[PDB]
DNA sequence: TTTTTTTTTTT
């Protein structure tokens, strides 16, 4: 490896050519599309990219999900180039905790370690918080993640740093002071939400440079969603209505919302039954109430809901009514279906960028859907070839057996698919994950399998999270019993079903021996940005996005080379029929054999 | 040529 990039030594040999290409084109000013599989060590490649850019003198920003942050700090904690230029991190308020409230909670619930941690400065206690504290050269006190270690059942939202907490409380001081972290280091880590929020603040005229010389976006497929959430302001009624109890026109606003299975989807002002009177009356009834005596945590409820009111005030945004999983509560949203001005503002403030993810391309090296999703200027965009190593598909045997009945939410399909699922559960030599597209489909399957499989069965639901079911899936495997997981939603994309009780030895990993696709993941995306992107583009957008979700669902099986005896099952009979529209999903499966 | 997911951790 003559004349290698900094940190290139610990990069997998397979990704060295891609790292070389990405480094050159990013240095050339292009916004680079670099796609590589999960187990190829994209974190090491990113660390080498950032270090090489940093020693050029570049102010470098690495935007990545907070979960990935700990891996990225470690991967470039020790390479000499970043050691000289320094590596810092930018954290928003939701990372921290109110010392007053979290201590006031520990006394109420008699949690000795929790109160004793806050008494004494809320010092970092985890290895991650302590080590990142040394790497940052800042002491990361009052961290939420540390507080969870002492009491997992703490009401996280009740205790988080709001913007309303007093200036004198240590947590807000630490956050506000650390807003200047980009001053004191060459490479800056943050989440996609932080980058989107920074871009929005830049547009409207602090925590990031005004111009980013080089930007690496890890898990870049999620960056689009972060902009949508940041640019969406949602009004929650029951928390507000309950907070004033401790106005009548707002009750009439809810009654009015009821007049207008699609309820007010992607319609800015075409329906105005009484919303603009009810909005304006709510605007004044909430902002005129006395700040004096308003609880330091209740003024936040007022502020966030008037923000949603004044985001629906402009009329420059779409509206949509949603309902909580717990109960049929009223929620009003003001999102944006066109995100070009904001995204373009980000890309202008960037000299060069590398977009890194495992699913960036629709087919081959075509990143046009991602280029349009993120509004990457075509002049600056660049599509490098992907890295799809052979070992990502080798341990997988694809079975011909499938469910003849087509998925139509019927009881008829549910039992037939359940019989095939039971057949998979018997032959399974480990954990089994069956992927469902709907709550209805998985609840139907649960009704047909709850008695048959008994304790083995895990059902994701409105009351059972993917994280909850993931914990039970690991636990049931710990107890030697072979679980089956009726998974939906986040189980499709973003669960690490690789066993960490077997670090050095992947050949003996059998946490997930059977993956079962019950249905092609069509209709899995309903965001305002994508729904508009579908209305203009047609069913191609539907099929391309479904294939992306399909590849991500298949990516749960193999997470590192050297595993063996992995089973892949796709039961959607449409795959095996003639229909031309299922041709892409056929082609993905064509890379397995026998 | 299709269909309903609750991500994340910003102000």
Nucleotide B3: nearest residue by CA–C1'?
Answer: A523
Residue A294 burial by Cβ neighbours in a 10 Å radius (0-12, 13-18, 19+): middle
Nucleotide B5: nearest residue by CA–C1'?
Answer: A489
Distance A534 CA to B11 C1' (A): 30
**Spatial separation of the C-alpha atoms in residues A569 and A553, rounded to whole Å:** 12
Distance A594 CA to B6 C1' (A): 37
Task: Indicate left, alpha or beta for A96 from its phi (over 0: left) and psi (-120 to 50: alpha).
Answer: beta
Residue with tokens 């069509």: A522
Nucleotide B9: nearest residue by CA–C1'?
Answer: A94
CB atoms within 10 A of CB A468: 13
Distance A519 CA to B1 C1' (A): 16
Distance A531 CA to B3 C1' (A): 12
* CB A424, CB A515: distance < 8 Å: no
Task: Describe the crossing of helices A42-55 and A16-27 by its angle, rounded to 10 degrees.
Answer: 40
The pair of three-digit structure tokens given for residue A405, joined into one six-digit string: 């009945």
Distance A489 CA to B5 C1' (A): 5
3-class SS of residue A85: helix
* CB A297, CB A101: distance < 8 Å: yes
Q: Three-state SS string across A277-323, please? A: HHHHHHHHHHHCCCCCCCCCCHHHHHHHHHHHHHHHHHCCCCCEEEC
Nucleotide B1: nearest residue by CA–C1'?
Answer: A581
3-class SS of residue A35: strand
Sign of CA dihedral A412, A413, A416, A421: negative
**Spatial separation of the C-alpha atoms in residues A59 and A182, rounded to whole Å:** 9
Nucleotide nearest to A440 (CA to C1'): B4
Q: Three-state SS string across A179-240, please? A: CCHHHHCCEEEECHHHHHHHHHHHHHCCCCCCCEEEEEECCHHHHHHHHHHHCCEEEEHHHH
Nucleotide nearest to A580 (CA to C1'): B1
Residue with tokens 């052979």: A390
- CATH code, domain with A424: 3.40.50.300
**Spatial separation of the C-alpha atoms in residues A219 and A24, rounded to whole Å:** 20
* CB A288, CB A302: distance < 8 Å: no
Nucleotide nearest to A579 (CA to C1'): B1
Q: What φ, ψ does residue A78 adopt, rounded to 5°?
A: -110, -10
Q: What is the extent of the structural domain holding A517?
A: 390-590
Distance A585 CA to B1 C1' (A): 13
Residue A146 host element (H or E): helix A144-150
Distance A526 CA to B6 C1' (A): 12
What resolution (Å)? 3.2
Nucleotide nearest to A222 (CA to C1'): B7
Experimental method: X-ray
In strand B, the nucleotides that come within 7 Å of a protein beta carbon are: 1-11
- Contacts of A525-528 spanning 24+ positions with Cβ under 8 A: A525/A549, A527/A225, A527/A228, A527/A335, A528/A228, A528/A232, A528/A266, A528/A318, A528/A320, A528/A335, A528/A336, A528/A337
* CB A48, CB A19: distance < 8 Å: yes
**Spatial separation of the C-alpha atoms in residues A422 and A418, rounded to whole Å:** 6
Nucleotide nearest to A520 (CA to C1'): B2
DSSP per-residue string spanning A442-506: HHHHHHHHHHHHGGGEEE-BTTB-HHHHHHHHHHHHHTT---EEEE-GGGTSS---S-SS-SS-G
Distance A348 CA to B7 C1' (A): 27
Nucleotide B10: nearest residue by CA–C1'?
Answer: A197
> A320-322 and A331-334: which strand pairing?
antiparallel
**Spatial separation of the C-alpha atoms in residues A226 and A124, rounded to whole Å:** 28
Residue A307 burial by Cβ neighbours in a 10 Å radius (0-12, 13-18, 19+): middle
């Amino acid at each position: 490896p003559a004349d290698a990039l900094p940190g290139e030594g610990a990069v997998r040999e397979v990704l060295r050519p891609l790292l070389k290409q990405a480094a050159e084109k990013t240095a050339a000013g292009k916004i680079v599309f670099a796609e590589a599989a999960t187990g190829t060590g994209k974190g090491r490649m990113i660390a080498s990219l950032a270090a090489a850019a940093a020693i050029k003198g570049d102010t470098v920003v690495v935007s990545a999900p907070l979960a990935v942050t700990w891996q990225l700090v470690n991967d470039m904690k020790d390479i000499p180039e970043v050691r000289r230029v320094g590596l810092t991190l930018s954290l928003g308020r939701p990372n921290f905790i109110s010392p007053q409230r979290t201590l006031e909670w520990a006394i109420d619930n008699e949690r000795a370690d929790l109160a004793a941690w806050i008494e004494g400065g809320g010092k970092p206690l985890s290895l991650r918080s302590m080590e990142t504290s040394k790497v940052i050269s800042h002491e990361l006190c009052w961290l939420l993640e540390d507080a969870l270690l002492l009491a997992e059942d703490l009401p996280a939202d009740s205790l988080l740093l709001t913007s309303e907490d007093p200036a004198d409380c240590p947590a807000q001081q630490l956050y506000v002071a650390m807003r200047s972290n980009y001053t004191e280091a060459g490479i800056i880590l943050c989440s996609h939400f932080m980058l989107a929020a920074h871009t929005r603040m830049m547009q409207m005229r602090l925590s990031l440079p005004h111009f980013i010389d080089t930007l690496i976006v890890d898990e870049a497929h999620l960056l689009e969603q972060a902009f949508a959430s940041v640019y969406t302001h949602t009004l929650r009624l029951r928390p507000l209505m309950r907070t004033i109890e401790g106005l009548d026109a707002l009750k009439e606003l809810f009654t009015q919302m009821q007049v207008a299975t699609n309820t007010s989807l992607n319609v800015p002002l075409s329906d105005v039954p009484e919303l603009i009177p009810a909005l304006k009356d709510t605007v004044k009834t909430l902002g005129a109430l006395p700040t004096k005596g308003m609880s330091r945590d209740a003024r936040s409820v007022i502020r966030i809901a008037t923000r949603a009111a004044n985001d629906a005030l402009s009329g420059h945004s779409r509206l949509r009514i949603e309902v909580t999983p717990v109960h049929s509560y009223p929620m009003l949203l003001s999102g944006r279906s066109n995100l070009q001005r904001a995204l373009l503002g980000l890309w202008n403030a960037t000299g060069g960028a590398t977009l890194v993810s495992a699913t960036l391309f629709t087919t081959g090296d075509n990143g046009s859907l991602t280029r349009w999703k993120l509004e990457v200027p075509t002049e600056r965009a660049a599509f490098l070839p992907p890295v799809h190593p052979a070992w990502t598909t080798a341990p997988v045997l694809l079975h011909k057996e499938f469910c003849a009945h087509e998925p139509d939410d019927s009881p008829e399909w549910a039992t037939e698919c359940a019989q095939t699922i039971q057949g998979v559960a018997s032959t399974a030599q480990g954990g089994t994950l069956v992927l469902c597209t709907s709550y209805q489909n998985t609840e139907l399957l649960a009704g047909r399998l709850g008695a048959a499989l008994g304790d083995r069965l895990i059902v994701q639901s409105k009351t059972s999270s993917a994280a909850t079911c993931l914990a039970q899936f690991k636990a049931k495997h710990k107890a030697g019993i072979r679980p089956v997981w009726l998974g939906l939603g986040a189980a499709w994309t973003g669960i690490d079903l690789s066993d960490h009780s077997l670090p050095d030895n992947p050949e003996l990993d059998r946490l997930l021996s059977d993956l079962v696709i019950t249905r092609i993941p069509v209709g899995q995306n309903r965001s305002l940005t994508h729904e508009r992107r579908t209305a203009i583009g047609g069913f191609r957008i539907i099929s391309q996005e479904a294939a992306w979700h399909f590849r991500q669902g298949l990516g749960r099986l193999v997470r590192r080379p050297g595993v063996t005896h992995k089973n892949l099952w796709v039961l959607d009979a449409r795959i095996y029929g003639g229909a031309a529209w299922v041709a892409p999903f056929r082609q993905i499966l064509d890379r397995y054999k026998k």
